[PDB]
Amino acid sequence: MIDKSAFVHPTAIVEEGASIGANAHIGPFCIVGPHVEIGEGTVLKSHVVVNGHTKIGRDNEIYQFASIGEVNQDLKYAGEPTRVEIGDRNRIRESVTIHRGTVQGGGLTKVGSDNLLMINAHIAHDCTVGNRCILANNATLAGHVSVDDFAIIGGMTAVHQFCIIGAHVMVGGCSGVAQDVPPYVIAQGNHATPFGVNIEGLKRRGFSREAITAIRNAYKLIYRSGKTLDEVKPEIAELAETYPEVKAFTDFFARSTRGLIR
Amino acid sequence: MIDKSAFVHPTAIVEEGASIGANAHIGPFCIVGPHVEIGEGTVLKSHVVVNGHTKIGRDNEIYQFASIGEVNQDLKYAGEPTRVEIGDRNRIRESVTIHRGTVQGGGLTKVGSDNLLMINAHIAHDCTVGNRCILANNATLAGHVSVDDFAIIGGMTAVHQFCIIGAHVMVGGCSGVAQDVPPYVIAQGNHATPFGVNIEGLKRRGFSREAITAIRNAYKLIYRSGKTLDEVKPEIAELAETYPEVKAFTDFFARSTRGLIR
């Protein structure tokens, strides 16, 4: 049902069954499917298509020509009732596309809160984007990709299927990410390789001098010590016993399946 | 107000306050904000969104799914009443996005006349595009970028913030421009580097044999003589005393702040 305080433009089409929260705004020429839930205060500027079993949070701003919850591009998808979940206060720009998941991939494409998805950014089926992330113009996430908190993906960069972009990572524009990127790392080029720690990002997010140094030492263990990953893992876990921020590496390794970029 | 000779499709929404010139054409499903000015003979095919304090010239052709004058993507922008100015006879293709400026950047995004902005070209906040330019498919200008007259930016090429693309320059597709490009130069690759003078372009624009040779000599001074830029500047100014076309370099150096690509 549509909340009494929500605004639905006369030219917009909200199908019976859709749930529109208080003070939400559905601009002209928008289409909202019957299985869609739009949270309180969320705004759909105009020309926005939202369908499928999709739940959108509060205070989001979705711009014209964006396509949310739409059928994915996986050739295996056959119309199964999969889903999309989007959090709060996200800024979804013109032409962004966020597709529903596939049964084979888990049936869910998820986006957190406080993210900025710039023009033509693409979030394919079964992706999981965290919070406070930035996908720049034309940034493209292939299916089954994970983008962790605070990560920034440069313009025209494509992340290959199943890859993980660690927390606080910064991927340079015009890049091709074919493997997993540990947290706190700066990567760039096709295929992408590591170029150090995102020090400036960590500074702005409140990390102490000690944590940043610990993180740099962890980085050196992985890419400088020359010791195989399995010999480095226990070393990093050891380091994390004193500097908690380093556990991010540990949690990341447990999820990695594509190997680390090098 | 709307000129009596202008056509506004019944499905289009032109908000009170908008100024539509004589013989202009606002196609179906278009949205024109109250602070917009559309010049004589300008055509909005259909599905075009134009808002903000935006002034558009005469005889422009704006295609479906384009977004003009819209809120920019700068995280610092807070809704201040900034502006966009677009000239005459521009061809703005499907999905092009031209965003309003930021107070911090000068409050204005400007586009000249006779430009061709191809599919999904992006002109970010505070950019200044001259006249007779071509931004190919997916060409992306980050904020505060200047693109001088006759410049051509290849497909999928991104120009980094604050950079200047000199007059008559040709940037190859799939490139990443991280510094300033002197006029008359051909650049390509990520990051972009110089590969000579755009001789064919100069030929087609009426440059004499003498001017082209002078320009090539100026190019050699910058990238071949081996002399530091500051030693070359007075040399080029000297050369310009005889061949005026060479002063373009002088005027360019005075505006450069990102250094020259090399």
Binding site: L116, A136, G155, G173 | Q73
Partner: peptide, 12 residues
């Protein structure tokens, strides 16, 4: 300091 998301870098 200046963040350039499209470039994917922190600029100075």
């Amino acid at each position: 300091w200046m963040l350039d998301p499209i470039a994917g870098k922190w600029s100075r």
